[PDB]
Amino acid sequence: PTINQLVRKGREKVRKKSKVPALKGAPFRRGVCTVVRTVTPKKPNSALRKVAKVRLTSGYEVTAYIPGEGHNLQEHSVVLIRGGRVKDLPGVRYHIVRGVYDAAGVKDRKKSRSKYGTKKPK
């Protein structure tokens, strides 16, 4: 644009859209599970990924991924969630943190334990 056009209208500073609206600005949110089931992923992957529908303290109800091998989560399981989509599970934008509230850690986990709420084995 001309210099006059810039004086008349300026440059638009465009805002960024949060990828985690259910968190309402927090790093984590506590919730309670309502549905605890498996969901098949999209092309070109095939599995039965473990997902929980969580009713958050922020008011939202969202679907969070349950990472690791096996879990202990059922309806009414208290749960902390964090940001993080699962690319291949459309609509899943959050992860449940293993090892907080009613989320157990992964059994017999040895590598990357801090990401799976598994304490050090003796």
Partner: protein, 99 residues
């Protein structure tokens, strides 16, 4: 010191008070172009002796009313209806700017 401005009397339909349109220029803070801005001041005319179209000087003065904090200092030039029309023609263009 008491700030002094220069502008043209664009209204005088008040008793003992004229409306003086002051103009000013400065570079745009970011785009450097020289831009014009304008502001009206309610000017104390205690002798109703200044007329529509008079380029005058007003001086920052102790408050006379609500919005009147400037008295006319002196005449600078007379018969500037060419400037008073620009102001009025803009105000007349506003009716077309609605819905």
């Amino acid at each position: 010191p008491k700030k002094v401005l220069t502008g043209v009397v664009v209204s005088d339909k008040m008793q003992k008070t004229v409306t003086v349109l002051v103009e000013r220029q400065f570079p745009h803070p970011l785009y450097g172009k020289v831009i014009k801005r304008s502001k009206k001041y309610l000017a104390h005319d205690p002798e109703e002796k200044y007329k529509l179209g008079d380029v005058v000087e007003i001086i920052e003065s102790r408050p006379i009313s609500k919005r009147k904090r400037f008295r006319v200092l002196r005449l600078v030039e007379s018969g500037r209806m060419d400037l008073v029309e620009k102001y009025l023609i803009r105000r007349q263009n506003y009716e077309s700017l609605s819905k």
